[PDB]
Design a protein around this ligand. Structure first.
Ligand SMILES: Nc1ncnc2c1ncn2[C@@H]1O[C@H](CO)[C@@H](O)[C@H]1O
Ligand SMILES: Nc1ncnc2c1ncn2[C@@H]1O[C@H](CO)[C@@H](O)[C@H]1O
Ligand SMILES: [Mg+2]
Ligand SMILES: [Mg+2]
Lengths: 254, 254
């Protein structure tokens, strides 16, 4: 038995770690420039701004910050994905809850994430985590973040979790709270909902992919919005044949 | 039937296209800086330089260039992966040969690759492809590259293929030929062998991942060496449980 190909890729391969180091190298270069020349706009969309016409929360004079998704963006949930590969019960919500409470010693940093977070703090940039881990598991999540070498997160100040408001897995509310306190100059994530809820809750697989190429959205990638790979679970693992293989690009062997 | 999760991710998801646009945004910013301030070293390793002590071919006064892997770096082989998902015969070498000869109309650019290649040429940077597609299929490959919106490749000048020397799938020989003519200021790929053959032909799954974090190699990612995702086939899809899930990071649900 080999693990699922996506987990071989993400957790086993040098290809995936090189991909992750690349994201954080670009992020650190971007943050350094914005520390020297403060932008007018932050990288967090204004409330009511749609994907057909993106607009952003002003940077103002607010203290500089970077916002990170947690799972598979700064921290690899190796123990849980081991359980999923061994048992085939990755979709078990009670197992994931147990993992939030007890997985502390089975996480690793995403390659380059521990180094990136130290550099941001040396630069005077506040590191803020916005994750859909549950509020009631804030203390074990704090411990897992620290165990992954990512420093000290504080619930309600530099850590925001699902349940901190009544929006569920929608992260726009927490993003608005963060953007009201900080000038967020970089934001990292492995899922499109780590940048805007507008990618989810409706849009199809093909619509979401097209939305990443809307010009005002496309300009963000590697330039304020920084992406980490996740072919293992979540919103990238959707679609039938007609949405994955467009019908003008099909072919049959002899 | 849904396609394999890796293909959903790579070909269907907005996550994957955002990841690819990020790589090319970082590449274009890197190339622009090196066009204004020519480096002393190119991004191609010197012959005999090992992964334990990387050294590079000098840039000199040679004309500026960028080197790209083709398959799943600048061009998506949608038709072939459709065939693999439909038939389960992705590993068929005769089917892949037929695809090299007849897949011309079933390719798409990797998101951002057509735009990136146009920008590099407007900057006066020569675009060179180094691919393990076969020399005998150079003409259909030229047509597929052009069909993907990537411009005109020329065999032996800006296109180098497997069989152009007696090294097989090893690309170091072609890299040395390119580096002798150009100052290569950026190199893109989806496989570690698109940067050095020293990652392959021996090193285990865990050894190759560690090698990407050797400091002189780690400095390259997003900073001369640019990586595109491929959780669908190739050297990232290897390893048993003990190499994917390190034994200090294991966990079992209640
Ligand atoms: N391999 C996986 N398959 C399904 N869900 C996963 C996996 N890894 C983590 N999860 C998370 O576990 C929960 C239950 O599916 C969700 O929060 C989901 O994001
Ligand atoms: N899904 C796939 N599975 C296996 N090989 C593939 C796949 N897609 C492309 N290839 C290529 O097809 C050839 C036969 O395995 C190799 O050159 C390999 O790189
Ligand atoms: Mg996440
Ligand atoms: Mg390739």
């Amino acid at each position: 038995e080999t693990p699922p190909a996506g987990m071989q890729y993400l957790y086993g391969s040098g290809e995936a770690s090189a991909l992750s180091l690349q994201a954080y190298q670009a992020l650190l270069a971007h943050v350094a420039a914005k520390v020297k020349v403060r932008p007018a706009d932050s990288v967090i969309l204004a409330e009511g701004a749609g994907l057909d016409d993106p607009r952003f929360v002003p940077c103002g004079a607010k203290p500089l910050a970077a916002v990170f998704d947690v799972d598979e963006t700064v921290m690899l949930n190796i123990g849980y994905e081991y359980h999923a590969a061994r048992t085939g019960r990755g979709f078990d919500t009670a197992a994931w809850d147990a993992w939030e409470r007890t997985g502390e010693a089975a996480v690793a940093p995403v390659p380059g994430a521990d180094r990136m977070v130290r550099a941001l703090r040396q630069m005077g940039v506040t590191v803020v985590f916005n994750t859909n881990r549950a509020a009631g598991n804030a203390e074990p999540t704090v411990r897992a973040i620290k165990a992954a070498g990512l420093g000290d997160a504080v619930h309600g100040q530099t850590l925001f979790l699902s349940g901190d408001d009544a929006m569920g897995s929608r992260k726009d509310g927490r993003r608005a709270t963060i953007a009201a306190r900080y000038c967020v100059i970089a934001m990292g994530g492995d899922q499109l909902g780590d940048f805007s809820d507008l990618f989810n809750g409706g849009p199809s697989v093909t619509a979401r992919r097209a939305a990443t190429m809307q010009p005002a959205i496309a300009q963000m990638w590697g330039n304020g919005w920084f992406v980490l790979p996740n072919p293992v679970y979540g919103s990238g693992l959707k679609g039938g044949f007609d949405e994955v293989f467009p019908l003008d690009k099909r072919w049959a062997a002899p």
